[PDB]
Symmetry: C3
Subunit: 199 residues, 3 copies
Amino acid sequence: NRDFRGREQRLFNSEQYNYNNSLNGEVSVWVYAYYSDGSVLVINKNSQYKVGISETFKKPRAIQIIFSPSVNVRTIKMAKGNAVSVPDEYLQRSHPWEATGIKYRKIKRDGEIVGYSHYFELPNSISLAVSGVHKNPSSYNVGSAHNVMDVFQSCDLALRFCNRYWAELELVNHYISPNAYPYLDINNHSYGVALSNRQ
Amino acid sequence: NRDFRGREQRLFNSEQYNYNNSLNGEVSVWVYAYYSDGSVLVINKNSQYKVGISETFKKPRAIQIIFSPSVNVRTIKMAKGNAVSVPDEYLQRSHPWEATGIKYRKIKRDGEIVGYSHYFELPNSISLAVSGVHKNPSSYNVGSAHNVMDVFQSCDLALRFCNRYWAELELVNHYISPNAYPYLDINNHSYGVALSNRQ
Amino acid sequence: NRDFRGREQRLFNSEQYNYNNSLNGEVSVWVYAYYSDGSVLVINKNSQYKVGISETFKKPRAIQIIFSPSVNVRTIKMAKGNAVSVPDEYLQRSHPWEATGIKYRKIKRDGEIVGYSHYFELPNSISLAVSGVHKNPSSYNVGSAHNVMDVFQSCDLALRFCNRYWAELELVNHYISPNAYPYLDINNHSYGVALSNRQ
């Protein structure tokens, strides 16, 4: 226990894990749209407290939604609409979302959860929105009298990124891996970096 | 009262009406922009709790704002700005909105309210925003300690649609009618489907 | 004190100042992006209660953020991200914002604060978000049980403007000055109109 360099390295990584999972940290969502030409569109949003994406897609063959490990899985919500942005046939009969958390698989590296994935192939246009709330183990209510304005400001402060990659290989090499992001490729292989209590 | 098929049909329609008007249901807004070439741009937004649209328009001849019957008319707000998105001449003297609910006409079919319309012709660019809150007969406050985060998530989950139709006839046939939407055409004719207690 | 025209003129201006600073009034933010060809992109957002902008920029040489005098400087927050919209190297170690209010200079005309400026030159792409909350001297909490829905509606009602000007001279003449906006040019000269207790 006299290897201070070893101890600092472990603490360096754990701190990252734990900061992300605190209420001071990010919650992140990615939407991946897969096209028949093998290219992939990603939209990412990163924000405090809660985060979401809402976009319309020209026919993808498939969609993968990934959240960061800092999401509360139980609060995940998805509105998947038709070509005119109606969630369920007609507005009059539409619940504005489905709570799809049960369908999310854990993306794991070395036994650690690096994210959560929901993947679905499709049978024109879809409108798709997805939302999740940052984990909060604690009693402190972020939407209190005292903190609600900070949540309002987080809506302004959320950062969006959107790009198209020509191939999943390009996505893995130039997007997922440089940025320490979680991912699940078509061969069901998990990508990500485990940090908690690790060197 | 032994025509169960008749009873189920009536209940099927009433349930739709009532679901829409519950707090589990959609509130919807449409902005229609009318151009001198007779084409029409629609923006629609559909969300839980509250909904709005905010866009800038190259000179339309006219604007029609329609809300679903699930809006609370008294909470309707509109910010109509100039070419640089200032609501009232100068920011220093601008109230950020006007409460225009009194100007909304009921769109009715068979005596039932299928929506609310505000229509105005214009005398360059306008910036236009409009907002409304879902009806709530009940005592339950959606923006409480316990439910405010769900309202935050509804901002992420809101679905937008935007298209241009070449003629009002095309709008009526391919947009309004296929989707059971309320509408008021230039001849003041009402479109929509009455559901409450109806077969 | 029998010059009623003089008294009304002074009151006319003071009322504008004071209305802006009330909770009924606007809070405004501008982002200015400066390019090597000498052109300038402005984004402006105007809303009640709180306001923000979030955009990605192809390499500007510099950024100036200006807020209206109705902002509370202490609540200003900025997220400046990399090319993939991450605020601080990696999501796991990112605080979603910095509170940069201390760096803001007062833009003054005739001793009156007409706005606040933060200016920074840059060493590809940046993602940039900025947010601020309208001043509230009073005890009344805008995000209360009773008023939180109005804050939700202000998110719908916020108006955005975006344009490119070819030169700072064009910005000053055609954008800042016609609209009584505050500004600080490259020569450190202040623009704006003083209103409080002034003729």
